[PDB]
Amino acid sequence: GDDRELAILATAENLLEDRPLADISVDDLAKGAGISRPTFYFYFPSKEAVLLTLLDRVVNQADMALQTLAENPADTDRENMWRTGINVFFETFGSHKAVTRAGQAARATSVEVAELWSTFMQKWIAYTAAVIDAERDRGAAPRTLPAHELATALNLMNERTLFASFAGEQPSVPEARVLDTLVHIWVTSIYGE
Amino acid sequence: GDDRELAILATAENLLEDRPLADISVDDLAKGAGISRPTFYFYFPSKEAVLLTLLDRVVNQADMALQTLAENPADTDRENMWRTGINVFFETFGSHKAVTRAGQAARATSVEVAELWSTFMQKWIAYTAAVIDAERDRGAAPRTLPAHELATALNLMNERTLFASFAGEQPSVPEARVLDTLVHIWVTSIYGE
Ligand SMILES: Fc1ccc2nc(Nc3nc(-c4ccccn4)cs3)sc2c1
Ligand SMILES: Fc1ccc2nc(Nc3nc(-c4ccccn4)cs3)sc2c1
């Protein structure tokens, strides 16, 4: 039952490490999962639904890790606070580079993927803005830009920059440098002027 | 001759304001340009080549405007310097929102579009880094991050944020706010700490 579903998911994530979703057949996923093609369709309506599920698991993994941090403030300076949070996305998505790259591509063709990404980005931006607001209330950050607009640009920067690094795009920040790069821009723009 | 080509280009840009390239036929472009379908193929091998040409014109328009600024330093403070430069992209791409949105989508399917965008992004990042380097040399900016890595993240932020605003994505910064938002992040991250 659920074993077969997890096997389909594992096959898909493994095959996506070597070629795009368009070059992966339903027969490919069935074979790698040890089932027939009609048995596959019992668990998933299409290979695109498999990717949707894989991406849903990754985004919820990142969201739950961020929720854990928010309930467990690490005892450090403000710079380290932001780094620990950005690192949740660096580590979670960087551990699922194939699903991440495939999910970004599917945003152009799948309404559910686009809506899934949009829902979680709105959640993460709202949390970023709430923390900026708290920092302003306690006197640690200046009241410069509207906090939600700042949070939006910083989160969109992280999306584009992290995914360019993971995919090895040209241009991109080297993966070994991208965390320091983003943290610097977040901290100077949140606390500067 | 060139009149027919410009007519095809104008028809394509007009039709892209209402539906994606996948929903525009070669017959659509021929009809709107007042020519036959075989005559169309004399000027362009495909509708994708039409988009490639449209995007090439827009990116070169932005590049030439930025080159004009670089040769004509406006007499203002450092903040205004950066704003005037970011504004080149805000105005150029914001005046061609349909071609911009279609070109971004084609990056996933067209090697020439992806290489075109990558070439000009590398050029614009190198220029950004050169200006940051000049500001550090004259003593106006601190030596914090590697300038080219900072420039990469700031330019990728601008790409993602401007295009989200133009497309009305959720989430996005309102178009009337995106210039102030980006300028703040550039100036604080280039001159801060
Ligand atoms: F402490 C905090 C509180 C909020 C907070 N928000 C963050 N930014 C985000 N990055 C992404 C993202 C997107 C695509 C790929 C990788 N990452 C989505 S939202 S980092 C952080 C740290
Ligand atoms: F003075 C200067 C010197 C360099 C400089 N570079 C800039 N950034 C760029 N933005 C984009 C972009 C991409 C996609 C959509 C819109 N814009 C490409 S490169 S703004 C600026 C101002």
Find the CATH number of the domain harbouring A178. 1.10.357.10
Q: Determine contact: B109 vs chain A, CB below 8 A.
A: no
Q: How much distance in Å is there from the Cα of A163 to the middle of ligand 2?
A: 19
Neighbour tally for A6: CB within 10 Å: 12
Looking at the structure, do residues A36 and A53 belong to the same domain, yes or no?
Answer: no
Looking at the structure, do residues B121 and B146 belong to the same domain, yes or no?
Answer: yes
Q: How much distance in Å is there from the Cα of B174 to the middle of ligand 1?
A: 20
Looking at the structure, do residues B51 and B41 belong to the same domain, yes or no?
Answer: no
Residue nearest to atom 8 of ligand 1 (CA): A155
Q: What is the torsion angle, in degrees rounded to the nearest 10, for the CA atoms of residue B178, residue B184, residue B189 and residue B193?
A: -160
Q: Which helix (H) or strand (E) covers residue A16, if one does? A: helix A2-16
Looking at the structure, do residues B32 and B64 belong to the same domain, yes or no?
Answer: no
Q: Enter the DSSP assignment of A151.
A: H
Quote the CA–CA distance of A165 and A177 in Å, as a whole number: 9
What domain range is B56 assigned to? 47-193
Looking at the structure, do residues A171 and A181 belong to the same domain, yes or no?
Answer: yes
DSSP string covering A71-124: HS--SS-HHHHHHHHHHHHHHHHHTSHHHHHHHHHHTTT-HHHHHHHHHHHHHH
In this structure, are residues A118 and A169 in contact, taking their beta carbons and an 8 Å threshold? no
| CB pair distance less than 8 Å for A170 and B122 | yes
| CB pair distance less than 8 Å for A125 and B156 | no
Quote the CA–CA distance of A54 and A9 in Å, as a whole number: 7
Quote the CA–CA distance of A91 and B172 in Å, as a whole number: 25
Distances (CA, A) of B126 to A24, A72, A95: 38, 41, 30
Quote the CA–CA distance of A98 and A100 in Å, as a whole number: 5
Q: Which two tokens mark A147? A: 């906090």
Experimental method of this PDB entry: X-ray
CATH number of B36's domain: 1.10.10.60
Looking at the structure, do residues A95 and A121 belong to the same domain, yes or no?
Answer: yes
Q: Shortest CA distance to A188 belongs to which of A156, A148, A145, A159?
A: A145
- CA angle at B13 for the pair B9 and B18, rounded to the nearest 5°: 145
Quote the CA–CA distance of A35 and A4 in Å, as a whole number: 8
Q: Which two tokens mark A2? A: 């659920």
Chain B nearest C-alpha distance from A144 (Å): 9
Q: Shortest CA distance to A57 belongs to which of A103, A108, A114, A106?
A: A103
Quote the CA–CA distance of A22 and B93 in Å, as a whole number: 31
* A155 pocket-lining for ligand 1 (C-beta < 6 Å): yes
In this structure, are residues B190 and B129 in contact, taking their beta carbons and an 8 Å threshold? no
List pocket residues of ligand 2, CB cut-off 6 Å: B 81-82, 85-86, 89, 93, 121, 124, 127-128, 131, 155, 158-159, 162-163
Looking at the structure, do residues A89 and A124 belong to the same domain, yes or no?
Answer: yes
Quote the CA–CA distance of B94 and A95 in Å, as a whole number: 36
DSSP string covering chain B: -HHHHHHHHHHHHHHHTTS-GGG--HHHHHHHHT--HHHHHHH-SSHHHHHHHHHHHHHHHHHHHHHHHHHS--SS-HHHHHHHHHHHHHHHHHTSHHHHHHHHHHTTT-HHHHHHHHHHHHHHHHHHHHHHHHHHHTTSS---S-HHHHHHHHHHHHHHHHHHHHHT-SS---HHHHHHHHHHHHHHHHH--
Looking at the structure, do residues B64 and B24 belong to the same domain, yes or no?
Answer: no
Q: How much distance in Å is there from the Cα of A58 to the middle of ligand 2?
A: 32
In this structure, are residues A169 and A103 in contact, taking their beta carbons and an 8 Å threshold? no
Q: Shortest CA distance to A14 belongs to which of A87, A80, A98?
A: A98
Looking at the structure, do residues B100 and B156 belong to the same domain, yes or no?
Answer: yes
Q: How much distance in Å is there from the Cα of A89 to the middle of ligand 1?
A: 6
Quote the CA–CA distance of B177 and B161 in Å, as a whole number: 11
Peptide bond into B146 cis (omega under 30): no
Quote the CA–CA distance of A52 and A110 in Å, as a whole number: 9
Looking at the structure, do residues A30 and A105 belong to the same domain, yes or no?
Answer: no
Quote the CA–CA distance of A10 and B64 in Å, as a whole number: 49
In this structure, are residues B183 and B82 in contact, taking their beta carbons and an 8 Å threshold? yes
Amino acid identity, residue B187?
Answer: V
**Number of structural domains found in chain B:** 2
User: In angstroms, how far apart are the furthest CA atoms of chain A?
Assistant: 62
Q: Determine contact: B122 vs chain A, CB below 8 A.
A: yes
Q: Shortest CA distance to B8 belongs to which of B18, B24, B19?
A: B24
| CB pair distance less than 8 Å for A188 and B184 | no
Resolution expressed in Å: 1.8
In this structure, are residues B137 and A132 in contact, taking their beta carbons and an 8 Å threshold? no
Looking at the structure, do residues A91 and A159 belong to the same domain, yes or no?
Answer: yes
Looking at the structure, do residues B85 and B159 belong to the same domain, yes or no?
Answer: yes
